[PDB]
Design a protein around this ligand. Structure first.
Ligand SMILES: Nc1ncnc2c1ncn2[C@@H]1O[C@H](COP(=O)(O)OP(=O)(O)OP(=O)(O)O)[C@@H](O)[C@H]1O
Length: 1412
């Protein structure tokens, strides 16, 4: 019985060349052997030379690749037929499965060869490949025609398979000659030559997926070298790719505008938009969305080709493996019948493997195509929105502010949810087909009990739909309650010094905590209504299986257990269960999408703007019909001029200025225009100022080149170099909104500086000296503006009421009654009775997450949580093994015992799922509660120096957003991770128990999964942060656009901001595309790992059940867990990345709870120190030397100075050195590192800081009123009496507002007293000074106030001296601080001057020098 090469039967009678040379059936296989080893032996040196820049794919190569893939498929099928035929006979018959194997290796090498000949564009070297292709085409044609001459027919399998790969070689020979025809290299005198694409020619595009071969489009191979690059260096934005041509937002915008033009030509409906959006979106994006849907439909169909293989495997493995032989026997060769082919065991396993390996690639490809179309939708639709921002009128809208906030939220939420609709759009095409084919083949598998189970799953989607609706309602109510909570947090982070100064931390912490616990009750209801979603989500399959098997056994009594049917039914149940919960969310996303398209359509058909200086006819309005708001305007202003304008208060100044800008709907009239009919870049600066959220030099230069001379002149004229030094960066500080909070004169001067700077042939100033109330600054600015515009020789127009210069030396223009009266000389206004006014890197977080779970849960519930999760997964393992054992023991024939224990295990499963769903929400609720109370308590017990050190933005961000993350993001991610990784460990444990060879094949596979997980985590964290920090400047740009719109359209500088918008949108979309494609590459890699798990498990299970005779119920339970392992890895990796990103805002929350200082410590005997404390006023400071960080510069040194009782020593000094330091340390609010600080003769070094800040009143520089009730705005901690509050709020100031208030002492302080006064704040300060029996009152100077307000403050200080008589005031306004008793001038941080009489202060040198 030796090693025969062809066959040893009949004593080598197949080695007989008689009866023709070609009619020997083994000789034809030798002929088919020939071309493959010919290609191997001519293409091995080529490939080895190759293995020892620029890419261009050959024309028509995608169908080349797909024909190669399907010929690999049919060659694997012929390998299977060859194995079953050479395996049935007694001999070896090696001529049945050697030629197919060498053909498989030849096809693999000829596609590697095609890739290595696609890398180097040298087409004359695939002539050999074409000479390969005709030879095999000839040879298998011979084989097919010999089957036809031997009359096999379509009955046997190998005839059909042979004809199939004949037409394979024919079609790829036709592809080869199509390439020959196109590129014209071999026999043509002139070869066609193509160039690499411009996206390749950029070299600044790494994301080369739209221009790469089809295998890398399928498996994302180019991502690998990217993701492995990301482990050495992190992924910067410069490391990211450019926005290539097919994905450039301008190009997609052009395509979308072509769609708009095509739709608007065919329909042209003016009050439409919705149908217009429908036709435009469909015509513009169907060419990719339908392709994504097609791949998704094919992936769904090949997904449902999974349980059929389980059914065939378990049905043949249950039927004893009796036959194992083909019927047909032609010429001593056994031909496999196709039923016996598709009835084999190993063959069906390999077919299952290749079907899963194509299903679970087309699903991810469909995902990716949907994502790419969604990102191009986001790009083009945001670009269209910005284009209709670039023409939108403001006064044709009433609420132009509320609508610009609306349109920014519109852009963000609307465009994002339109993007999310085009993410989820193939689901509404496939999930119905998924469910329908699932119901159909589940009825084919099992029966009417499967229809009962399908009624369970079809009655588990409306429950999720209704639960998500109630959840969204609860989330709305929770967020609109937590908005008030966040407003309370903003009111608690703006006033740290004022609340610690007025001893108002405890009452405001309680007023925050009451709203927080109300929001916590609302969040508890939210957690219940989102726990019930998880409970229904995790108990619908258990009830489905229970009702299914209970129907088939108890209710049907039709057939046996049918384990092939059972495990196919279970796998069908999982494959049907997965889309079902997703579809309710899809329908919700569709509803949100329709609302979003309605919103953006009602936006898109809003009013546009419009289609030397001279205006003749004069009618101009805002409303597009009726009432011209500025008419009779006949004014001419040629170049070389400086027209001052004038008028009454609100007499049409900004209306005339905007009418000169061309931003008003001019009904009657003409606009002559001539630049030294098209419009020029008129410079403008509105009444309301505006600054881009950028640097101050960036808000000054305004996208223009930078010279030192004009910038120095603008910093000098507007007094900006002291303003630059007032900021810690100057020309680098983030000016305006989202940055350094400026002042109105400073912002007006910066806007005027950019207007003056912008080098224009005209300059419009719509009252710049209106808000800059610094008169000497305004006069120096006016003179420098006159000098600059005279030395620049450019036309100017200043429309204001500053009549100090307007009748003197201008070519003025006067607007009377909202119309132009006279634009001439000053003598005409001295002749129209108008001169009377003119003569007047970390990996993970494991410590912080452990600290969170430890300090949050408590082991009596953390143990219960882990135990309930483990018990639920053990119960699911138990129900699976009980189903397997019951289906096995019913086929081999206590059946009611099996059904009863199956029902009582499904009930325990449902109960444990309810328990885990309760436990997750309860753990998250207690976590958020105790973490919030810890953060609030640690934020109360803080010094004001920490609030000086760290900003409120960082504290508020890691407060609010991390509270949101630990309130609405951490419990769901924890539930998903704790179900996904535990289901994964359960399934792989079950696979290893059923197949004990699996763990041996698991360990290298798990190592590969761990390394892929590590590199994906490293890349995905950085791409997530790059997504967030790229989508932030885009809405920042939409804010700065909608805010200063008329300035941009005034400058005619729209195209540069259009390009800045397009650059911002491209930089956001490319990061979104990298995050999408990294997610999809992760899912593809883990899905091939799962397919190899399926292959090894199925192979070893069928091998040990053919021979070792396994309890084949366990084999089907193995395959249906290898499939659910296969998607448990997906959720495991995704939930691990989400838990990493969500736990990063809690590592920071714990880190900001780890900053505690300013401990209240009364170390004396507190029984007598704050009762004696009121009304003495005797705080004798004895050499108390101060420091703050105790680093480089103490201020107070050995200052042994006393304030006498009654002697209200207003002691002002140098405000840089000795004013504020003593005023801060007087209230024990600084580090007096030595000395002795007495307080009315008591020890202020051991006082209760609650009691110390209670019985020592103060005044402020920028005073503020804490929002609340009027009794809570006056004295919340005291609440003494109403008549005392009337006496305070009467005798200080504001009596005619307090008695005229709607509430009285019980009225709402409207968020700081937003329109009360600024002296009403000082009146409340005097109220708190008069109410708390406070003799002392530590005062600082007013920053900005009126002289009469300062005189009223002096009169109130006289009344405070008449009622309290103790005061210590420091004032950089030294000229009003002179009415005192004693004074101290503390220059350059020392105790330099002290004058206990006031006349010695006016007598001595330095104090009088401080008085001048
Ligand atoms: N962009 C706009 N949005 C809304 N209303 C506008 C707009 N432009 C002009 N109007 C209307 O024009 C009318 C005139 O306002 P007005 O002309 O007094 O500006 P102004 O005289 O420059 O104000 P001020 O005297 O404070 O500088 C007002 O009713 C105003 O609402």
């Amino acid at each position: 019985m030796p090693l025969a090469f062809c066959g040893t039967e009949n004593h080598s009678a197949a080695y007989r060349v008689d009866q023709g040379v070609l009619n020997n059936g083994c000789f034809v296989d030798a002929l088919n052997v020939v071309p493959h080893v010919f290609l191997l032996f001519i293409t091995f040196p080529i490939l080895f030379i190759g293995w020892g820049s620029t890419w261009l794919h050959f024309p028509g190569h995608n169908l080349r690749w797909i024909l190669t893939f399907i010929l690999l498929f049919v060659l694997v099928c012929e390998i299977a037929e060859g194995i079953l035929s050479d395996g049935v006979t007694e001999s070896r018959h090696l001529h049945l499965y050697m030629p197919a194997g060498m053909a498989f290796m030849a096809a693999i090498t000829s596609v590697v060869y095609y890739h290595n000949i696609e890398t180097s564009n040298f087409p004359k070297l695939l002539i050999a490949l074409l000479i390969y292709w005709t030879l095999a085409f000839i040879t298998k044609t011979i084989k097919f025609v010999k089957f036809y001459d031997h009359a096999i027919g379509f009955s046997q399998l190998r005839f059909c398979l042979t004809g199939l790969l004949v037409i394979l070689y024919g079609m790829l020979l036709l592809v080869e000659v199509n390439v020959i025809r196109v590129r014209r290299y071999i026999f043509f005198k002139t070869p066609r030559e193509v160039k690499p694409p411009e996206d390749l020619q950029d070299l600044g595009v790494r994301f080369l997926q739209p221009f790469v071969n089809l295998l890398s489009k399928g498996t994302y191979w180019w991502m690998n070298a990217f993701i492995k690059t990301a482990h050495k260096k992190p992924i910067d934005l410069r490391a990211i790719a450019k926005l290539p041509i097919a994905m450039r937002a301008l190009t997609n915008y052009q395509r979308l505008c072509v769609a708009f033009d095509a739709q608007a030509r065919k329909d042209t409906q003016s009050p439409q938009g919705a149908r217009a959006i429908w036709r435009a979106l469909c015509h513009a994006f169907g060419r990719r969305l339908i392709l994504s849907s097609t791949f998704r439909i094919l992936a769904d169909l090949l997904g449902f080709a999974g349980p059929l293989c389980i059914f065939g495997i378990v049905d043949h493995l249950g039927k004893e493996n009796h036959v194992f032989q083909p019927k047909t026997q032609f010429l001593g060769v056994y031909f496999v019948s196709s039923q016996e082919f598709l009835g084999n065991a190993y063959v069906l396993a390999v077919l299952l493997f290749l079907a899963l390996l194509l299903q679970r690639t087309f699903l991810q490809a469909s995902y990716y195509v949907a994502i790419e179309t969604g990102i191009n939708l986001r790009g083009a639709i945001q670009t269209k929105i910005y284009n209709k921002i670039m023409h939108m009128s403001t006064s044709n809208l009433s609420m132009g502010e509320m609508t610009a906030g609306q349109i920014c939220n519109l852009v963000a939420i609307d465009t994002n949810q339109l993007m999310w609709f085009f993410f989820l759009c193939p689901n509404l095409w496939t999930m119905p087909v998924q469910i329908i084919v699932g119901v159909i083949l589940l009825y084919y598998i099992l029966g009417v009990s499967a229809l009962i189970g399908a009624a369970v799953i079809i009655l588990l989607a409306p429950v999720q739909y209704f639960v998500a609706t109630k959840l969204s309602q609860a989330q709305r109510t929770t967020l609109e309650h937590s908005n008030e909570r966040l407003k309370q947090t903003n009111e608690m982070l703006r006033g740290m010094k004022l609340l610690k100064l007025y001893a108002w931390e405890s009452i405001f912490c309680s007023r925050v905590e009451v709203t927080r616990r109300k929001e916590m009750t609302s969040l508890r209801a939210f957690a219940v209504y989102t726990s019930i979603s998880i409970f229904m989500n995790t108990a619908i399959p258990i009830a489905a299986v229970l009702i299914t098997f209970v129907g088939h056994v108890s209710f049907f009594k039709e057939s046996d257990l049918s384990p092939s049917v059972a495990f196919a039914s279970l796998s069908l149940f999982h494959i049907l269960v997965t889309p079902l919960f997703l579809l309710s969310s899809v329908v919700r996303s569709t509803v949100k999408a329709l609302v979003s398209v309605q919103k953006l359509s009602e936006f898109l058909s809003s009013a546009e703007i419009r289609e030397c200086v001279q205006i003749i006819g004069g009618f101009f309005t805002w409303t597009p019909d009726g009432i011209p708001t500025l008419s009779n305007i006949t004014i001419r202003i040629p170049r070389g001029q400086l027209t001052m304008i004038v008028g009454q208060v609100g007499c049409g100044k900004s209306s005339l200025l905007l009418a000169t800008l061309g931003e008003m709907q001019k009904v009657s009239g003409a606009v002559f225009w001539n630049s030294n009919r098209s419009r020029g870049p008129v410079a403008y600066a509105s009444q309301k100022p505006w600054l881009l959220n950028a640097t101050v030099e960036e808000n000054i230069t305004f996208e223009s080149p930078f010279n030192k001379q004009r910038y120095k002149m603008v910093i000098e004229a507007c007094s900006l170099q002291p303003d630059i030094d007032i900021l810690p960066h100057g020309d680098q500080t983030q000016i305006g909104e989202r940055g350094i909070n400026l002042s109105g004169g400073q912002r007006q001067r910066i806007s005027v500086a950019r207007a003056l700077y912008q080098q224009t042939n005209v300059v419009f100033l719509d009252d710049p000296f209106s808000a800059l109330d610094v008169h000497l600054s305004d006069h120096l600015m006016q003179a420098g503006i006159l000098e600059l515009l005279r030395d620049d020789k450019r036309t100017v127009v200043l429309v204001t009421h500053k009549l100090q210069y307007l009748p003197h030396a201008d070519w003025i223009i006067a607007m009377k009654d909202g119309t132009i009266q006279r634009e001439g000389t000053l003598k005409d206004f001295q002749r129209s009775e108008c001169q009377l006014f003119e003569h007047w890197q970390r990996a993970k977080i494991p410590w912080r997450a452990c600290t969170k779970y430890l300090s949050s849960a408590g082991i009596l519930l953390l143990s219960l949580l882990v135990f309930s999760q483990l018990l639920k997964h053990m119960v699911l393992v138990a129900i699976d093994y009980w189903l397997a054992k019951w289906t096995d023991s019913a086929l081999v024939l206590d059946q009611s015992v099996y059904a009863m224990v199956f029902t009582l295990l499904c009930s325990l499963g449902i109960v444990l799922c309810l328990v885990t769903s309760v436990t997750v929400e309860w753990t998250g609720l207690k976590v958020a509660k105790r973490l919030h109370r810890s953060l609030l308590n640690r934020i109360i017990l803080a010094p004001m120096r920490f609030f000086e050190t760290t900003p409120l933005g960082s504290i508020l961000n890691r407060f609010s957003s991390d509270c949101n993350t630990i309130d609405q993001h951490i419990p769901s991610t924890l539930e998903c991770l704790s179900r996904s990784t535990l289901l994964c460990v359960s399934a792989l444990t079950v696979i290893s128990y059923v197949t004990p060879v699996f763990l041996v094949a698991l360990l290298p596979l798990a190592v590969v999964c761990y390394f892929i997980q590590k590199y994906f985590r490293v890349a995905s964290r950085d791409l997530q942060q790059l997504d967030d920090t790229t989508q932030l400047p885009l809405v920042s740009h939409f804010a700065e656009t909608v805010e200063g719109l008329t300035t941009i359209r005034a400058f005619r500088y729209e195209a540069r901001f259009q390009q800045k918008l397009l650059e911002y949108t491209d930089s956001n979309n490319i990061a979104s595309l990298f995050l999408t494609a990294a997610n999809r590459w992760l899912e593809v890699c883990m899905e091939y790992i799962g397919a190899c798990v399926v292959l090894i498990a199925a192979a070893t299970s069928i091998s040990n059940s053919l021979h070792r005779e396994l309890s084949a119920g366990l084999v089907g339970l193995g395959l249906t867990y290898a499939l659910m392992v296969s998607n448990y890895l997906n959720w495991m990796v995704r939930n691990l990345a989400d838990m990493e990103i969500q736990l990063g805002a809690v590592k920071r929350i714990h880190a900001l709870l780890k900053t505690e200082a300013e401990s209240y410590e009364g170390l004396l005997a507190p029984s007598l120190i704050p009762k004696n404390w009121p009304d003495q006023g005797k705080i004798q400071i004895q050499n108390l030397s101060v420091r703050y960080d105790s680093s480089l510069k103490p201020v107070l040194k050995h200052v042994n100075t006393l304030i006498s009782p009654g002697q209200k020593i207003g002691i002002c000094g140098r405000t840089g050195s000795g004013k504020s330091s003593f005023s801060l340390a007087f209230f024990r609010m600084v580090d007096m590192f030595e000395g002795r600080i007495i307080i009315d003769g008591i020890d202020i070094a051991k006082l209760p800081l609650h009691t110390l800040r209670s019985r020592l009143s103060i005044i402020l520089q920028d005073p503020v009123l804490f929002s609340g009730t009027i009794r809570f705005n006056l004295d919340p901690e005291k609440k003494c009496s109403d008549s005392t509050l009337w006496e305070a709020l009467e005798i200080a100031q504001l009596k005619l507002v307090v008695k005229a208030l709607p509430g009285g002492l019980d009225a709402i302080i409207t968020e700081g007293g937003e329109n009360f006064s600024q002296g009403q704040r000082q009146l409340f300060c005097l109220a708190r000074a008069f109410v708390r029996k406070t003799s002392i009152f530590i005062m600082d100077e007013a920053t900005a106030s009126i002289d009469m307000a300062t005189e009223n403050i002096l009169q109130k200080v006289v009344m405070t001296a008449f009622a309290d008589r103790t005061v210590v005031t420091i004032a950089h306004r030294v000229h009003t601080i002179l009415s005192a008793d004693l004074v101290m001038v503390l220059k350059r941080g020392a105790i330099l001057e002290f004058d206990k009489p006031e006349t010695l202060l006016s007598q001595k040198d330095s104090v009088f020098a401080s008085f001048v």
